[PDB]
């Protein structure tokens, strides 16, 4: 049962696995039908874009802090800053998120600029609007017209300024202070 110098394997095939084998023979068929659904949905509502405008948000965790991506909806504060009520915004292609808030100014300002850019390119029709004006427009792709753009990393030339304390020493001292903060505070309180 165990023989030769081989890696030890974990092949989880002791259940009735053959009754639950999903082979994706329909990958191409699903691609084509997905494209047809996408075309029909666009042509139904043209020239209105098929995608609602989405915000830009920082990705969570220490591993994806650096990246920025499309969020779910603009916060109520952001829409307040651009003077759009959420109920109205949902009817002009803007997504709303009551759950997200703005602790910091950077994401708030980015999304306010994004909303103002969309509002400048928005044209809302009405009863007085004729089919000549409606036909004068093309169905744009909002996800590409207002793309999520990563802030550029700092590069180029800058003056070198060398502090007396090294960066490694700074990190070591920060670690030590965090590690012994509680016991040092207890000792000082007792003293």
């Amino acid at each position: 049962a165990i023989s030769k110098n081989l890696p030890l394997l974990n092949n989880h095939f002791r259940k009735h696995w053959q009754e639950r084998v999903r082979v994706h023979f329909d990958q191409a068929g699903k691609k084509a039908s997905r494209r047809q659904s996408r075309l029909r949905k666009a042509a139904k509502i043209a020239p209105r874009p098929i995608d609602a405008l989405r915000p830009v948000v920082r990705a969570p965790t220490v591993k994806y802090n650096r990246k920025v991506r499309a969020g779910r909806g603009f916060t109520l504060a952001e829409l307040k800053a651009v003077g759009i009520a959420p109920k109205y915004a949902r009817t002009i292609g803007i997504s709303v998120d009551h759950r997200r808030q703005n602790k910091s100014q950077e994401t708030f300002d980015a999304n306010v600029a994004r909303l103002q850019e969309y509002k400048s390119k928005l044209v809302i029709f009405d009863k007085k609007t004729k089919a000549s004006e409606v036909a004068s427009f093309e169905q744009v792709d909002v996800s590409a017209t207002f793309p999520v753009e990563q802030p550029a990393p700092e590069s180029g030339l800058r003056a070198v300024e060398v502090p007396e304390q090294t960066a490694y020493r700074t990190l070591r001292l920060a670690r030590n202070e965090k590690k012994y903060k509680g016991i040092r505070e207890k000792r000082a309180k007792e003293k």
Partner: protein
């Protein structure tokens, strides 16, 4: 095969002691199926050994760069007359390869006009080869929607389609292809190099943008045409050159004389 084929029986082995093999047997009585062997790959009406499954591997991955390597090699082979002739194309009356035709042939809309152009440019003897090559397929594949076989004709490559695809659609053996989307199934049919390709002028001039050159970057992202491992592919002149022949020792006899 069906997942339950050969297994729709309640057959049970009789065991030993009844002077018959220990294969499972059908129970009951009153029919001739009763007492007959079941479930075995050797048994009439049993299931096959290792019944075929749908989760067999059907599609095969090929590295994109290697696939492009092969596409470039097949395109290059289309310009070698010996390869096209060994490939079987009736190209003896074409004055040079590649065969490039003017762009008016991108706009012919009738099959009659397209056939006239093929005749004019010398590519209709290969169509006649396709016509004369029609045979009933040998084997049971003719019961499966593959009833006739025939040769492959010229591949006509265009840059703009103004009716050429439909004009050549019904001509037997002729394939049409945009210069933007060329693949090995058309460029080397049967894995055999040397497809007879008729280029329109637009397609021929677009080739250099599609695959790039030393002065033009390819439209394919980050793609460069491959490099050969040998610079002079004619090794006879390398061997019989001044540089090599000036430093070699004199040759012996083609056949050693028998001395004992």
């Amino acid at each position: 095969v069906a997942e339950n084929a050969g297994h729709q029986t309640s057959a049970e082995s009789w065991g030993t002691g009844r002077a018959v093999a220990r294969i499972p047997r059908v129970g009951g009585g009153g029919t001739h199926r009763s007492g007959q062997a079941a479930f075995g790959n050797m048994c009439r009406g049993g299931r096959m050994f290792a019944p075929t499954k749908t989760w067999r591997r059907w599609n095969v991955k090929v590295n994109h760069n290697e696939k492009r390597y092969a596409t470039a090699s097949a395109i290059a082979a289309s310009a070698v007359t010996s390869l096209v002739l060994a490939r079987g194309h009736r190209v003896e009356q074409v004055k040079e390869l590649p065969l490039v035709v003017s762009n008016e042939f991108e706009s012919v809309t009738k099959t009659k006009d397209a056939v006239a152009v093929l005749k004019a440019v010398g590519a209709h003897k290969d169509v006649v080869k396709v016509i004369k090559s029609k045979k009933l397929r040998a084997g049971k594949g003719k019961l499966r929607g593959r009833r006739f076989t025939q040769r492959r004709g010229p591949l006509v490559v265009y840059a703009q389609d103004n009716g050429i695809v439909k004009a050549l659609r019904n001509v037997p053996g002729v394939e049409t292809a945009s210069v933007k989307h060329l693949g090995l199934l058309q460029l080397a049919p049967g894995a055999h190099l040397g497809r007879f390709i008729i280029w329109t002028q637009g397609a021929f001039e677009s080739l250099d943008s599609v695959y790039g050159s030393d002065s033009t970057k390819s439209i394919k992202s980050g793609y460069t045409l491959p490099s050969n491992i040998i610079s002079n592919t004619d090794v006879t002149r390398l061997i019989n050159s001044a540089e090599v022949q000036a430093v070699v020792r004199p040759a012996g006899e083609k056949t050693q004389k028998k001395s004992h």
